[PDB]
Design a protein around this ligand. Structure first.
Ligand SMILES: [Zn+2]
Ligand SMILES: [Zn+2]
Ligand SMILES: [Zn+2]
Ligand SMILES: [Zn+2]
Lengths: 69, 19, 116, 1180, 56
C-alpha cells in the first residue's frame, strides 16, 4: 500500500526515497532508471523495490474518515 | 533485435508534444 | 434412369409390359395414361459412384475467398488462374485427387494421372 | 503520423484494443443483456397476456334477469422505479449498494403497470349473437406487481450516473465493474448458460442397433409470443441392407410418425411430381429420386387433401373429435403446431411444404453420403444465455402465474358474491419471491448452479467469474474438447482441472455476445430488394437461385446474391443494420443466412479492401485513424470524440461470429501477410501462407486468451497444461480485490501488505488493471540445490525478507448475529450473561464484552473468546445435569471466536434487518506471515510450499551481496518444460537493471538472444548465471546459479488453516462416532481403502483397535434363545430379562460398533431378524 | 532426428543434460521439445481435424 521501509533482499532503507523518486520523475523529467541510479539504488533488488511499488494509500485516502475528531 | 520494454510513461508526452 | 411423370395428372409413371406387342410401356397408376418406353433401363443401383465429386460449382465459385488459388494450366484456354478443391463426397473411400476450376472459361478438369 | 493513408504496423493495433476496452469494458455482455431485458423485454412479456376477460352469461332464470356481462382487465405500459427499500415500520427510502450489502437487503426496484378495467353488457335475447357494449364504466392507476433485482452499474442503478468522486463519496470502489446482483446482502453473478441454437436443421446418424439410419431434427423455437419449443424429427427407416427405406416425420400430438407424402398431401400438394419438385430441386438427381421412390410408394393410397387430413387427425390424442372434426383438428395442428417458427397463421402452407422439402433434401444428401453429419460442438450452432434471457423466461413464467391468480380471484369474487379488491387480486410477492429465490439459489425454477456467489478473493478472480460460462452435460458428443470454432471466442487454456474441465468456458478478452434485434426490417429490406416470395418459387425454371434464410426461416430466393450481399455488407459496415447481425453467404451451397437472434458470440476484426492505389489488399484502418484514436485517448487526461463506435461506423472493423467465420479468410498480422510476396536465427519460423484473398485481419492474436490467461508472461513458451494450471491458480493469489475493503463486511478477506506490479508485464494486463491492484511480489529467485530442503516442489525462503515484510498478509473474518423473536412470548437479546443467571454458558472468558454484549473495536481476542454475547429465555420444568435453580432464568446463545484463530477486533456495526430485528456484524483482523507450510506459486504452474527458512547470513550470496528471497529446485524445470519461467526471470533482471517494464506479451518479436544482449550490456552474464558463495563457509560454489527477479504469488492455502489433531472429542448423535469437520474438533476417516491396506499388512489387531477403540464401541446384551438384542439389563440390581423368551439366565454380552447396532435395529424395523449367536451350529 | 541432433550438440556441463543422464528428471523428448521442436499435435490419435469446413 505504502512504500516499504526496508528492501526485502538486503535491508537497505528505501522508504525515504519515494517522494524524491516521484519528484525526479515529474519535475526533472528523468527516466525511471536514471532516477533510481541518482537516488543511490545500485542493486536491482532495491531498484525493483522502488520501481514496482504501487501506491494504494493514495486511493484509500479518498474515502471519508470513518470516525471524526 | 527488438525493444523488450513497454514505453508508456513518456510515450504519451512524446505524442502530445508531436501534436 | 430418367424418371417420367404423367402428362394429365403429373403423377409418377410406372413400367408395365404389353404382351400383345411384347413391349415396354410406362403407365400411370391412377389416371390410365400410357406411353411407349424409350430405353430398356428401369433401375440402377450405383454402389461405387462418382456423382457429387464436382457438386457445388457455380458461376461465381471464384468469388469465394477461402478457396485456394493455383497456377496450373487449363488445357482448353491456356490460362494460369484457377481454384482447386478436393472431392465433395464424404465417404471414407475416395482418393485425394484435386479438381480445378478455371476462372476464365468456367471449365473443370482434374489432376488425376492414373485413370483420368 | 506523416500520411493519413499509410498502412499501420503491429504496434498500432493496441490503440484500437484500448479504444475497444474504453467503450465496452470487461462486463459489457452482462450489463448490455440486463439493460436490454429491463428496457424492452419486460414490456414485451407483459404485452402478451395483458387482456383477461371473464364473461358471465345470461343465466336464464327469469325474464327480469337476462343481461350478460363481460369484465376485462388489461395491462398497459410498465414503469420501473429506482432501487428502494421499505422498512418494518412502513417507511420507504432509496437504497444504495453499500447499505444493501451491510443490512442484508436485496438491491431491487419496484415495478408498476397501468391497468384498465372495462365492463361490457348485452341483452341476451335467446337464439341470437350478442352485441357487447360498454356500460360507461371504464376505470383507469398504477399497480405494484413486485420488485425486480437490479444489476449494479446498470441503467437502473444509482452508480451508473456517478463519477469517481461520487463513487468515493458513496463508499464504492471505482475499479469495481458491477455485473452482479445483491440478494440478501450476498453478491450473486449469473453464469452464462450454453445451449444448442434453435430453428436450425441438424442431421445425425444413428448406430447399427436401431431401425433408423439418419434423422433430421429441428427444435422449432419462437423468440416472441409464447416461448414454447416444439421438436420436429424426420427419420429414414431401414438400413443400407434393406430393400425399402422410407421417410417418416413425427408431428406433435400425433402419437405416430406419418409418411412425408401424406404430410405433403395434407399440406395441399397431391401431385407426386410436385412433391418431388418440392424435395429435389434438380431434374438429373436420379439417385435422390430413386431413394425417394419408397416414400411415394408408401403414400400411394392417399390421393387427396381431405383424406390425408383425416388420416393425420385420427392419429391425434384428443378423443373428442368424433368423425367430422378430424379434418379441422389435423388442419389446426398442421397450422399452429407444425413448424411454428415459420408462422402460425392460416394461408402459409407453401412455406411449410418448402421447408419440409428442404429438411428431407438435407437428410437425403446425408444418407447419400454427400455431406457429413452436422457437428454438435460447432460454436456457431450454440447460444449463450446471459442474465437477460434467463430473467426474461423466469419473468414470463412468474407473470403467467400472476395472471392466473388474477383470473382466479375474479372468478371467486363473481361466484361467491364478494367485493373486488385489486390489492388482493394482484399479489406482488409472486414476482418478488420468485425472482429472489431464483437468484439466491441456483435452482432456476418457481437447472442448478445458474447463480453463484461472486468471487472477491482477488480482482482477476472476480473478472473471470463475471466472464465465466457453463455447459450442462443423454448426449452423443465430446463437449469437453477444445473445438476449432472456439478460436477467439473462449480462452483455450482457462478451464477447471476437475470434473468441470472443458464444460466451464471463459470468454476471450475481445469476445462479446449479441443482444438481438427485430428481423422484420431486414425481411422488408430483402423483399424490396428483389427477394422473390417463396409462394411462387419453381425450382425447375430457376436452378440457379440462392435461398435466403433469416433466423433459420426460408423466406425466399434471390437471383443475384452477389449484389444482394454487397449491398447488405455495405449497409452493415456504414451502420444502417446493427453490426451484431451476422450474414453468411454459402456460395457452394447457394445459401444466404442472416442471423439476428440473441446469444451469438462474436469478436471484431479489421477489414481488408483491394485499395488499388497501392496495387494490393490492405487494411482500411490507417495511421491517421490511429492518430485520431490516440489523440482521443490522451485528451481525456477538445478534439471531436473518436471511439470504437466511430471505427465501427466508418467500417474499419467488423463484428464476426463463428458462423460467419466459416466463409472468411483472416490474415494473422499485417506486418508480413498483407504485403505482397536475412532471417534472424532466433526468431520464430512463421508461415506466410502466400494468400492474396484475405478479407479480414486479426487485431492481435494475444487477444484469444482470457482474463486469467492474459497474466501469464510468454505463455507461448510454456506447455499448455501449465498455462491451465496457472489460470486456475491465479484466482487464488492474494492481492487487493477492492479499495473499499475497510468499509466492506465480507465473510473472509485477504490483503497483501506490499503488492508489487510484475517486472515482466503483458500489454493485455493494462486493461485488466493488474498494475493498479496487483496480487504478488517480485522476489529474487535463485534456482539451485542448496540444502535439499526444496526437493519435490518445495522452496526455501529468506527469513530476513519475511521479517522485513515479504509476502505478509492481512486476514479479515466476519461474524454475524441476529436477535430472533420466537413468537410473542420468546425473544433473544444481546446481553453479557452472568454465571448466576445464565445456564450452559461457554467456558470462555466474558470479560471483554460490554453492557451491550459486543466487544469494542481495537480489543484483542484469542481462542474461545466470546465476541457477541446473546441470551434467550428458557421454559421451566427442565433440569439438565442439575445445576438448574430458581435463580437461572436465561440461557446463553453467544457466538464464540474460532478456536484456532485470534487477532484484534477491527469494526463492529449494529443495525436492523428487513424485519426490524437488531443484528450485528463483527470483523476481526489477523496477520499471516509466511511459514514452513504456506503455499506459493509463480505464473507458470510452478507451485510449492516453503520447506525451510534461512537467514541472510545462511543464504548463498553473490559478489554483489544480493541474496535470494526464494530458492526453487532445478528439477522442476525440465519435466514441466516451463521455459517461460526462465525467460521471465531474465527479462525481469534486465527490466530491474534498466528501469523499465518487461514486455511479456505472447506473440511479439522479443527473443531470448535480444534479452541476453541487453543483460550483457549491463555487466552481467548474458544467460543470467552468477558466481555464488556458500553462506556457511564462503567458498565459491562449483556450479553457477540462475539468479534473478521473478513474480511470485501467495496462495490461499495455509498450513495453520489445515493442521488439526484429535485424541477424543464430541460424537454425532446418530452413529455415536467422531464428528466430521476440523472446525468442530472432528476426526479423520479410516476408509475402505485404509482397511484394505491394513488387511494386506495383516495387522488384524490394529484394524480392530481402529474400528472399535478409536471409534464407536458399544456393549449389548443378547439372548441365547433369540439372537435379538432385546435383553433388558438392570445392571444396578444385577438382573437380566428377555421378555418373549421367558428366560433370565441365558444372556450374553458382546462388544460391537454402535453403527453395527444401528444397522441391526434398522433391519429389525424393516422386518429382518439378524440373530447373533455365540456358538456354531454347522461344521466347517 | 532433430532431438537427437540437439542432444548430441549438448555439452557435458549442460544442466538439463546432467539431470537426464543421472535419471533424476527429464528425458530425450523433453530436451528435444525444449530445444529443437515440439512436433506434431494429435487429438484422438489423429492429426488436427477440420473443425471448420475443409480447414482447421
Ligand atoms: Zn536491496
Ligand atoms: Zn397420371
Ligand atoms: Zn480455362
Ligand atoms: Zn430371547
Amino acid at each position: 500500500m505504502i512504500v516499504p521501509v526496508r528492501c526485502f533482499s538486503c535491508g537497505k532503507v528505501v522508504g525515504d526515497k519515494w517522494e524524491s523518486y516521484l519528484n525526479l520523475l515529474q519535475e526533472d523529467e528523468l527516466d525511471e532508471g536514471t532516477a533510481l541510479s541518482r537516488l543511490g539504488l545500485k542493486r536491482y533488488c532495491c531498484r525493483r523495490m522502488i520501481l514496482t511499488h504501487v501506491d494504494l494509500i493514495e486511493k484509500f485516502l479518498r474515502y471519508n474518515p470513518l470516525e471524526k475528531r | 533485435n527488438a525493444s523488450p520494454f513497454i514505453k508508456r510513461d513518456r510515450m504519451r508526452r512524446n505524442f502530445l508534444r508531436m501534436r | 434412369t430418367t424418371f417420367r411423370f404423367c402428362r394429365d395428372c403429373n403423377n409418377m409413371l410406372y413400367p408395365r409390359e404389353d404382351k400383345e406387342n411384347n413391349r415396354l410401356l410406362f403407365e400411370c397408376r391412377t389416371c390410365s395414361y400410357v406411353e411407349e418406353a424409350g430405353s430398356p433401363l428401369v433401375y440402377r443401383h450405383e454402389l461405387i459412384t462418382n456423382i457429387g465429386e464436382t457438386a457445388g460449382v457455380v458461376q461465381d465459385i471464384g468469388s469465394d475467398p477461402t478457396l485456394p488459388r493455383s497456377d496450373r494450366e487449363c488445357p482448353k484456354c491456356h490460362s494460369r488462374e484457377n481454384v482447386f478443391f478436393q472431392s465433395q463426397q464424404r465417404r471414407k473411400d475416395t482418393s485425394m485427387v484435386l479438381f480445378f476450376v478455371c476462372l476464365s472459361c468456367s471449365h473443370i478438369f482434374t489432376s488425376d494421372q492414373k485413370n483420368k | 503520423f506523416e500520411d493519413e493513408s499509410a498502412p499501420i504496423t503491429a504496434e498500432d493495433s493496441w490503440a484500437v484494443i484500448s479504444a475497444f476496452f474504453r467503450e465496452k469494458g470487461l462486463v459489457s455482455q452482462q450489463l448490455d443483456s440486463f439493460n436490454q431485458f429491463v428496457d424492452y423485454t419486460l414490456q414485451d412479456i407483459i404485452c402478451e397476456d395483458s387482456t383477461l376477460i371473464l364473461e358471465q352469461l345470461a343465466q336464464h332464470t327469469t325474464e327480469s334477469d337476462n343481461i350478460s356481462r363481460k369484465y376485462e382487465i388489461s395491462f398497459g405500459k410498465i414503469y420501473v422505479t429506482k432501487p428502494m427499500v421499505n422498512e418494518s415500520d412502513g417507511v420507504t427510502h432509496a437504497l444504495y449498494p453499500q447499505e444493501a450489502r451491510l443490512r442484508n437487503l436485496t438491491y431491487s426496484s419496484g415495478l408498476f403497470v397501468d391497468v384498465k378495467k372495462r365492463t361490457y353488457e348485452a341483452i341476451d335475447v335467446p337464439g341470437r349473437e350478442l352485441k357487447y357494449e360498454l356500460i360507461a364504466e371504464e376505470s383507469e392507476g398504477k399497480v405494484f406487481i413486485g420488485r425486480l433485482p437490479i444489476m449494479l452499474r446498470s441503467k437502473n442503478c444509482y452508480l451508473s450516473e456517478a463519477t469517481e468522486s461520487d463513487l468515493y463519496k458513496l463508499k464504492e470502489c471505482p475499479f469495481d465493474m458491477g455485473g452482479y446482483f445483491i440478494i440478501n446482502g450476498s453478491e450473486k453473478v449469473l453464469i452464462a448458460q450454453e445451449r444448442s441454437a434453435g430453428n436450425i436443421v441438424q442431421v445425425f446418424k444413428k448406430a447399427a442397433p436401431s431401425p433408423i439410419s439418419h434423422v433430421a431434427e429441428i427444435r422449432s423455437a419462437l423468440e416472441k409470443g409464447s416461448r414454447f419449443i416444439s421438436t420436429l424429427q424426420v427419420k429414414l427407416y431401414g438400413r443400407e441392407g434393406s430393400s425399402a427405406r422410407t421417410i417418416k416425420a413425427t408431428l406433435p400430438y400425433i402419437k405416430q410418425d406419418i409418411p412425408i407424402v401424406i404430410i405433403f398431401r395434407a399440406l395441399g400438394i397431391i401431385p407426386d411430381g410436385e412433391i418431388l419438385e418440392h424435395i429435389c430441386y434438380d431434374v438429373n438427381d436420379w439417385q435422390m429420386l430413386e431413394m425417394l421412390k419408397p416414400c411415394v410408394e408408401d403414400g400411394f393410397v392417399i390421393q387427396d387433401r381431405e383424406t390425408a387430413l383425416d388420416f393425420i387427425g385420427r392419429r391425434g390424442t384428443a378423443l373428442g373429435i368424433k368423425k367430422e372434426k378430424r379434418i379441422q383438428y389435423a388442419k389446426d395442428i398442421l397450422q399452429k403446431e407444425f413448424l411454428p417458427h415459420i408462422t402460425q397463421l392460416e394461408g402459409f402452407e407453401s412455406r411449410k411444404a418448402f421447408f419440409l422439402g428442404y429438411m428431407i433434401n438435407r437428410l437425403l444428401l446425408c444418407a447419400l453420403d454427400r455431406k457429413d453429419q452436422d457437428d454438435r460442438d460447432h460454436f456457431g450452432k450454440k447460444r449463450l444465455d446471459l442474465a437477460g434471457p434467463l430473467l426474461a423466461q423466469l419473468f414470463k413464467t412468474l407473470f403467467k402465474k400472476l395472471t392466473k391468480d388474477i383470473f382466479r380471484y375474479m372468478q371467486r369474487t363473481v361466484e361467491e358474491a364478494h367485493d373486488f379488491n385489486m390489492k388482493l387480486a394482484i399479489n406482488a410477492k409472486t414476482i418478488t419471491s420468485g425472482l429472489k429465490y431464483a437468484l439466491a439459489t441456483g435452482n432456476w425454477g418457481e437447472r442448478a448452479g445458474v447463480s453463484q456467489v461472486l468471487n472477491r478473493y482477488t480482482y482477476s478472480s472476480t473478472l473471470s467469474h463475471l466472464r465465466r460460462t457453463n455447459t450442462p452435460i443423454g448426449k452423443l458428443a465430446k463437449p469437453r474438447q477444445l473445438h476449432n470454432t472456439h478460436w477467439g471466442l473462449v480462452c483455450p487454456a482457462e478451464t477447471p482441472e476437475g470434473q468441470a474441465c472443458g464444460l466451464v468456458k471463459n470468454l476471450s478478452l475481445m469476445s462479446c455476445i449479441s443482444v438481438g434485434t427485430d428481423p422484420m426490417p431486414i425481411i422488408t429490406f430483402l423483399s424490396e430488394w428483389g427477394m422473390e416470395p417463396l409462394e411462387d418459387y419453381v425450382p425447375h425454371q430457376s436452378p440457379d437461385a440462392t435461398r435466403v434464410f433469416v433466423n433459420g426461416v426460408w423466406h425466399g430466393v434471390h437471383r443475384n446474391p452477389a449484389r444482394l450481399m454487397e449491398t447488405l455488407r455495405t449497409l452493415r459496415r456504414k451502420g444502417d443494420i446493427n453490426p451484431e447481425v451476422s450474414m453468411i453467404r454459402d456460395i457452394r451451397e447457394k445459401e444466404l443466412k442472416i442471423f439476428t437472434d440473441a446469444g451469438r458470440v462474436y469478436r471484431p476484426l479489421f477489414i481488408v479492401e483491394d485499395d488499388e492505389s497501392l496495387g494490393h489488399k490492405e487494411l482500411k484502418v490507417r495511421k491517421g485513424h490511429i492518430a485520431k484514436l490516440m489523440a482521443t485517448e490522451y485528451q481525456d487526461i477538445d478534439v471531436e470524440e473518436y471511439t470504437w463506435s466511430s471505427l465501427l461506423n466508418e467500417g474499419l472493423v467488423e463484428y464476426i461470429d463463428a458462423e460467419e467465420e466459416e466463409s472468411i479468410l483472416i490474415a494473422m498480422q499485417p506486418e508480413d501477410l498483407e504485403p505482397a510476396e536475412d532471417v534472424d536465427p532466433a526468431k520464430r519460423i512463421r508461415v506466410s501462407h502466400h494468400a492474396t484473398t484475405f478479407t479480414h485481419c486479426e487485431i492481435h492474436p494475444s487477444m484469444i486468451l482470457g482474463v486469467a490467461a492474459s497474466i501469464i508472461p510468454f505463455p507461448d513458451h510454456n506447455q499448455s497444461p501449465r498455462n491451465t494450471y496457472q489460470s486456475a491458480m491465479g484466482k487464488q493469489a492474494m492481492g487487493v480485490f477492492l479499495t473499499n475493503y475497510n468499509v466492506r463486511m465480507d465473510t473472509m478477506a485477504n490483503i497483501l501488505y506490499y503488492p508489487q506490479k510484475p517486472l515482466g508485464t503483458t500489454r493485455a494486463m493494462e486493461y485488466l488493471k493488474f498494475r493498479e491492484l496487483p496480487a504478488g511480489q517480485n522476489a529474487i529467485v535463485a534456482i539451485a540445490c542448496y540444502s535439499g530442503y526444496n526437493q519435490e516442489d518445495s522452496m526455501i525462503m529468506n527469513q530476513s525478507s519475511i521479517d522485513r515484510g515479504l509476502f505478509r498478509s492481512l486476514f479479515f473474518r466476519s461474524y454475524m448475529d441476529q436477535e430472533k423473536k420466537y413468537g410473542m412470548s420468546i425473544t433473544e437479546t444481546f446481553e453479557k450473561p452472568q454465571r448466576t443467571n445464565t445456564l450452559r454458558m461457554k467456558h470462555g472468558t466474558y470479560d471483554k464484552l460490554d453492557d451491550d454484549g459486543l466487544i469494542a473495536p481495537g480489543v484483542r481476542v484469542s481462542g474461545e473468546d466470546v465476541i457477541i454475547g446473546k441470551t434467550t429465555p428458557i421454559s421451566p420444568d427442565e433440569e439438565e445435569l442439575g445445576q438448574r435453580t430458581a435463580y437461572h432464568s436465561k440461557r446463553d446463545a453467544s457466538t464464540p471466536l474460532r478456536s484456532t484463530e485470534n487477532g484484534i477486533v477491527d469494526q463492529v456495526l449494529v443495525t436492523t434487518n428487513q424485519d426490524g430485528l437488531k443484528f450485528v456484524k463483527v470483523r476481526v483482523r489477523t496477520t499471516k506471515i509466511p511459514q514452513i507450510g504456506d503455499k506459493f506459486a509463480s505464473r507458470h504452474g510452478q507451485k510449492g510450499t516453503i520447506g525451510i527458512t534461512y537467514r541472510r547470513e545462511d543464504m548463498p550470496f553473490t559478489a554483489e551481496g544480493i541474496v535470494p528471497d526464494l530458492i526453487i529446485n532445478p528439477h522442476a524445470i525440465p519435466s514441466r518444460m516451463t521455459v517461460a519461467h526462465l525467460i521471465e526471470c531474465l527479462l525481469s533482471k534486465v527490466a530491474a537493471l534498466s528501469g523499465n517494464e518487461g514486455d511479456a506479451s505472447p506473440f511479439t518479436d522479443i527473443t531470448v538472444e535480444g534479452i541476453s544482449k541487453l543483460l550483457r550490456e549491463h555487466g552481467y552474464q548474458s544467460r543470467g548465471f552468477e558466481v555464488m558463495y556458500n553462506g556457511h563457509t564462503g567458498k565459491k560454489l562449483m556450479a553457477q546459479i540462475f539468479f534473478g527477479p521473478t513474480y511470485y504469488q501467495r496462495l490461499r492455502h495455509m498450513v495453520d488453516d489445515k493442521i488439526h489433531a484429535r485424541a477424543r472429542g464430541p460424537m454425532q448423535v446418530l452413529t455415536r462416532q467422531p464428528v466430521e469437520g476440523r472446525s468442530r474438533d472432528g476426526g479423520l476417516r479410516f476408509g475402505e481403502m485404509e482397511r484394505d491396506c491394513m488387511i494386506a499388512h495383516g495387522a488384524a489387531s490394529f484394524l480392530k483397535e481402529r474400528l472399535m477403540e478409536a471409534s464407536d464401541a458399544f456393549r449389548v446384551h443378547i439372548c441365547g434363545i433369540c439372537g435379538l438384542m432385546t435383553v433388558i439389563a438392570k445392571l444396578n440390581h444385577n438382573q437380566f430379562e428377555c421378555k418373549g423368551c421367558d428366560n433370565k439366565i441365558d444372556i450374553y454380552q458382546i462388544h460391537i460398533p454402535y453403527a453395527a447396532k444401528l444397522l441391526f435395529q434398522e433391519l429389525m424395523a424393516m422386518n429382518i431378524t439378524p440373530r447373533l449367536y455365540t456358538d456354531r451350529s454347522r461344521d466347517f | 532426428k532433430a532431438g537427437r541432433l540437439a542432444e548430441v550438440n549438448l555439452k557435458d556441463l549442460n544442466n538439463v543434460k546432467q539431470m537426464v543422464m543421472a535419471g533424476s528428471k527429464g528425458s530425450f523428448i523433453n530436451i528435444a521439445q525444449m530445444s529443437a521442436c515440439v512436433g506434431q499435435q494429435s487429438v484422438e490419435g489423429k492429426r488436427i481435424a477440420f473443425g471448420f469446413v475443409d480447414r482447421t
